Amino acid sequence: ELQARSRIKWAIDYITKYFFTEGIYLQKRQREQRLLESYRAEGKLGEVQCRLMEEPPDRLHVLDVGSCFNPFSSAPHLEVTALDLCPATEDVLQADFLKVEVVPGIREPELEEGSVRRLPASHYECVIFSLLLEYMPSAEQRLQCCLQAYDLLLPEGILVLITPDSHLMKNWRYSLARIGLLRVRFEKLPHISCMVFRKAISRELSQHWASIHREEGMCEEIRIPQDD
């Protein structure tokens, strides 16, 4: 029995609205298509390749990284693959996410010696990093995780990012835009920030947005307060 008003219920509700009950993936699609027209009209971008999602399937492919106990798996039409460095429950796969390869053409996790080594590229409507990134040892490795999430997501799929409290979020927005993830939601919950980043229709589009909004002194990586 999940806690109401938790990060878990927030994410389930957002995922449902984004893919089914509010068609947010289409709203943001139109927004990105307008942004691309504006950039082309200013000569800042040429013809770029766009990749669009098809109508979402009823059962969404969801990857829960750092899952611990698979809280999302009973949520309606989420087909959850849950990974954790130290699984707490038997339905969570053991994996160090930093050592996972993203492989096109496979359709399920591939394990060696009980540890996930390979995950299907461009396969998941949604990737969830709920309180995960602050356990990574470096800002480089936090970015690495999001780069892998990018390769794992279908076009217009979403990376759900939940992180504790203690701006740095402006820099995260810039750094993720640089690699093709545009932020589409930010909400404060008790003691946490809840964010969603979308695999934009075009990586080059997102890259150019990031270029326009780069501020002095902000870095490429994903820092946390305890980087000092």
Ligand X SMILES: Nc1ncnc2c1ncn2[C@@H]1O[C@H](CSCC[C@H](N)C(=O)O)[C@@H](O)[C@H]1O
Q: How far is the CB of 96 from ligand X (least distance, A)?
A: 5
Size of the residue set binding ligand X (CB under 6 A): 16
Q: Per CB under 6 A, does 171 bind ligand X?
A: no
Select 153 or 182, whichever has its Cβ closest to ligand X.
153
Which residue of the chain is nearest ligand X when measured via CB?
A: 66
- Would you say 177 and 169 are in contact if contact means Cβ atoms under 8 Å apart? no
100 to 62, 64, 115, 151, 177: CA distances (angstroms):
16, 14, 9, 12, 23
- 59 or 135: CB nearest ligand X: 135
- Least separation, in Å, of the C-beta of 160 and ligand X? 10
Please choose, from the candidates 72, 124, 127, the residue with its C-alpha nearest in 3D space to the C-alpha of residue 97.
127
Distance of closest approach, residue 10 Cβ to ligand X, in angstroms: 11
Of 55 and 112, the one with the shorter C-beta distance to ligand X is 112
Which listed residue (50, 121, 131, 189) binds ligand X by CB under 6 A? 131
CB of 15 to ligand X, least distance (A): 15
CA dihedral 100, 102, 103, 107 (to 10 degrees): 90
Query: What mask, x for binding ligand X by CB under 6 A, covers residues 65 to 104?
Result: xxxx--------------xxxx--------xxxx------
Contact range with ligand X by CB under 6 A, out of 11-19, 116-124, 125-133, 191-199:
125-133
Q: Which residues are annotated as a binding site for S-adenosyl-L-methionine?
A: 7, 66, 84-85, 96-97, 130
Residues binding ligand X (CB under 6 A): 65-68, 83-86, 95-98, 130-132, 135
Annotated binding site for S-adenosyl-L-homocysteine: 7, 66, 84, 96-97, 130
